[PDB]
Amino acid sequence: IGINNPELFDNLAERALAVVQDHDARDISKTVTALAHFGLKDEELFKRLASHAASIADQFDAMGLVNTAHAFARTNFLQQDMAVALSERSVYVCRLLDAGETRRLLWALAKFQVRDPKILTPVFNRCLALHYDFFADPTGSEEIEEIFDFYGPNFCPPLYQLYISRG
Amino acid sequence: NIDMSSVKAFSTRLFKTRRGCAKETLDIRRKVLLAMSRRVGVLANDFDLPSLLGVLQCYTVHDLTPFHLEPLAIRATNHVGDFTPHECATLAHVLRKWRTMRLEVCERLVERICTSDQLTHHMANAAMIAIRTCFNQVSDGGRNAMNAEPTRQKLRAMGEQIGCRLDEVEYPALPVILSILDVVVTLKIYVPKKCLQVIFSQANDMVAIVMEQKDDPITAEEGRQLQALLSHYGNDLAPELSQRMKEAFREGVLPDEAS
RNA sequence: AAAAAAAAAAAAAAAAAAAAAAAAAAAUUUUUUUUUUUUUUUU
RNA sequence: UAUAUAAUAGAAUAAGAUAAGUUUUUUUUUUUUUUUUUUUUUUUUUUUUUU
């Protein structure tokens, strides 16, 4: 809806902190996205959520993995166990995602600093698969800049050639 | 972002094989027609004139009438002056299935059906059913009760104008005759006696076969209404078919519909 | 001292233009029924 | 002088969340307040003419 209600938010955040263990994949993918959007950050709650999602890394669907990774990346809260656990899972699901979701996941991975071909190879194939929608998203025209800065031209000659091209 | 030729090719491929499709493949078909409907909806302003009718038929045969494709039918109501009477008759039923069928569109539609040198049974049936539906369209007990009868008289006027040329057409089967006669009777349209004679002679000649061959079909109800229609209109239309139907009912050669 | 004419100031009435502020409602009657097969292509 | 047959019935009755496929004027009327212009009326001041 787009409404800010702080006082209620603090109580809900504390209660969620008290009940961290009961979260599912859907609950984490919702709570983390909402907290990232609204600006209210809790260090201990986020550490507990990342540690819990480390064990539940297999239960994420197409939406949850990408959304959780992007929300963690924008919050600058980058645990390493969560980083590896979520990055390894990307190869299984990469066929299902959409263009914008793949772009967001790639930006989160670039901020994750993994640079491992085993993880990165299917993501670039899928990005080439939906390159028309990939390069026609204004909400993220600046989001590809950091990805291509981190990886560099020596990584994907076709994607780099298309990027340099007018479009 | 599907190309213009791609949608046409896929639709034509999925349309022309519909007549004998296997059952367990139907549902998947519809999904293919729904995952890419929005592109057709936005491209609605670029399709060629017969391609519109083709796409509408391809969507209709798969029992699918999504709202996103409603503008296409609207275009058909605007460019109706280019189609042949056969295509116009098909467009009448297509429009009726799209809820687009109103009074003015049918009023403009009937002329193209009229312009044919020789009528065919599809055009006659489409005209009759469209006229009946648009007669049901006008409301007496409504907020516009001032011009109900002045509109019904006009509708009957065209009805007569298409009825006077009904002797030129061959009637493939009895149900077509029943539909035309039902519209005529329930709408109170006068018809010339020559067209009545041709209709009833054709019905007699066609109904001879099933009775004489003792098997293949005509339901007993159908014979009831045919006998009743002639009795209302007179025996002189077919002074032989009267006793012919009476004998056919006496022998019980026409089984019930639920039998 | 009185009358007429011209100019300036103030008050009231009418008309036109610009700006700002306030208000605009509703009452269940919408539609159904073909045997339709005419896209075009080197995938 | 043979190696082979197979058939009976009854009932009427309803549960309930999957992160989805629009957007193409903005304007008219009434009332109040302020500002500007024009017309009419009244008051004051100045100048000219006549008695």
Automatic annotation (TrEMBL), chain A:
Domain of life of the native organism: Eukaryota
Protein name: RNA-editing substrate-binding complex 6 protein domain-containing protein
Source organism (scientific name): Trypanosoma brucei brucei (strain 927/4 GUTat10.1)
Section of the entire sequence shown: 345 to 511 of 516
TrEMBL record, chain B:
GO biological process: cytidine to uridine editing; mitochondrial RNA processing; mRNA stabilization
GO molecular function, one term: RNA binding
Record protein name field: Mitochondrial RNA binding complex 1 subunit domain-containing protein
Organism: Trypanosoma brucei brucei (strain 927/4 GUTat10.1)
Lineage: Eukaryota, Discoba, Euglenozoa, Kinetoplastea, Metakinetoplastina
Residue span relative to the full protein: 273 to 542 of 543
